[PDB]
C-alpha cells in the first residue's frame, strides 16, 4: 500500500539513535571535564556497543542502523564519527568543516560547541520526525 514513510521513520529513528549514543558519550565527557574525538583516534561506529556485545543473533546485522552504516559512501569496513558526519546517503544532509579532537581547553571552551553543532543537524531530524509523525498520525 503506502508503508515507505514508516521505513523512512525507521531510518530517522536509527539516525537519531546513533546521534543519541554519540551525545551520551558527549554529555558524560563534558561532565567529566574531558575532551572528545571524532577521528581515527576515537571509536568506530560500526560496533555492537551501539546496543550490546558480539553478534546478539543476526538482529543487529539486520538493523536499519547496521544497514545504513554499512551502506555509506564513507564506509570502508570501518567508519569514524568524522566519516559518519561527512558521510552519505542519509536523510539529514552532510556536515562540513569537521576537525579531529575537541579539547576541554578552559575559556572559549569548545567541546559544548561541537555538541551544539551535532544538535544543529539533530534539529532537522526533530523537524522531519514532527512532520512525518504528524502525517503518519493522519494515517
Amino acid at each position, epitope marked *: 500500500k503506502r508503508k515507505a514513510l514508516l521505513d523512512e521513520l525507521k531510518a530517522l529513528t536509527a539516525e537519531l539513535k546513533v546521534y543519541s549514543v554519540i551525545q551520551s558519550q558527549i554529555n558524560a565527557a*563534558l561532565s567529566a571535564k574531558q575532551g572528545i574525538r571524532i577521528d581515527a583516534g576515537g571509536i568506530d561506529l560500526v560496533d555492537p556497543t551501539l546496543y550490546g556485545y558480539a553478534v546478539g543473533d543476526p538482529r543487529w546485522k539486520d538493523s536499519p542502523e547496521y544497514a545504513l552504516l554499512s551502506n555509506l559512501d564513507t564506509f570502508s569496513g570501518k567508519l569514524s564519527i568524522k566519516d559518519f558526519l561527512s558521510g552519505s546517503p542519509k536523510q539529514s544532509g552532510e556536515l*562540513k*568543516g569537521l576537525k579531529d579532537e575537541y579539547p576541554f581547553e578552559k*575559556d*572559549n*571552551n569548545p567541546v*559544548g*560547541n561541537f555538541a551544539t553543532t551535532v544538535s544543529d543537524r539533530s534539529r532537522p531530524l526533530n523537524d522531519k520526525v514532527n512532520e512525518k509523525t504528524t502525517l503518519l498520525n493522519d494515517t
Partner: antibody
Amino acid sequence: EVQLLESGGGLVQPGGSLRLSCAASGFSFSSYAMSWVRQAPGKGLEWVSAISGSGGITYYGDSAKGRFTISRDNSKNTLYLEMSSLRADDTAVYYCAQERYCDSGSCYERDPVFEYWGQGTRVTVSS
Amino acid sequence: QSVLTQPPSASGAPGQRVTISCSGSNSNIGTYFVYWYQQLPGTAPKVLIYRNDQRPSGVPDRISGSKSGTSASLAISGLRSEDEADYYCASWDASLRGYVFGPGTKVTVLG
C-alpha cells in the same frame, strides 16, 4: 588592526534577490560559528539568524513568510546571507557576529553570550 | 519571569567617574560574567568588556564590570568622547522576558 569586512550591499529590486557577505581579518577565524543581526533608524538591534542558518527558516521569526537564508565558509574565513521576494520593509542595515567567550558551561543552553561584530551596510528596495 | 531593566540615564563632564546599572535574577545573572555594548554616533555597535572586567586590545581598563544577586552593573573612570553613546547591557536575544536586548540608555560626556 584586527577586524571584519563586509561585501555585497547597496540597492535591490522587488521580487528579485541579492547577497550580503562578511569576511574576517587579523585573526584566524578558522571554524567559529556565526550569527546575523539587523539594524534600522532610531533603534538598537535584532536577530536575523542564529549559528548557521538553522535558526534561519525561509519564512522568518519562528514564522512570518519571508525567504531569507545563509551559507558558511570559515575556511575562506567568510560567510554569506541571501535576500529574496522582497517587501519594502526588508530595506534596512545588517551585521554579523562570532562566538567566543564561554567556560565551565555556565549557561547550560547555547552559550555564555557571543563576542565580536562586523561593520555592516545599507540595503534598499530601489523601485 | 521578567527581570532586567535599563534605567541609569547618566551624563558627566570629560574625565569624570559614572556608575551604570541594570536589574535581573538568579536563574540568569549567576550564569554570566560581564559583557556590554557601546555605539558612537554614525557607527555600527562595538565591544566593551570581558574576563569579568578586561577592556579591548585597543582601550585601557577605564571600566569595571560588576554584578550582585538580582542586579548587574558597571562603572567607568576617565570618560572620553568615544564614550559619547547609547549603551546596551544586552544578552543577544528577545526570548520570553520583557527585557533580553532592551532599549539601551543614552549617556553623554558633558563637553
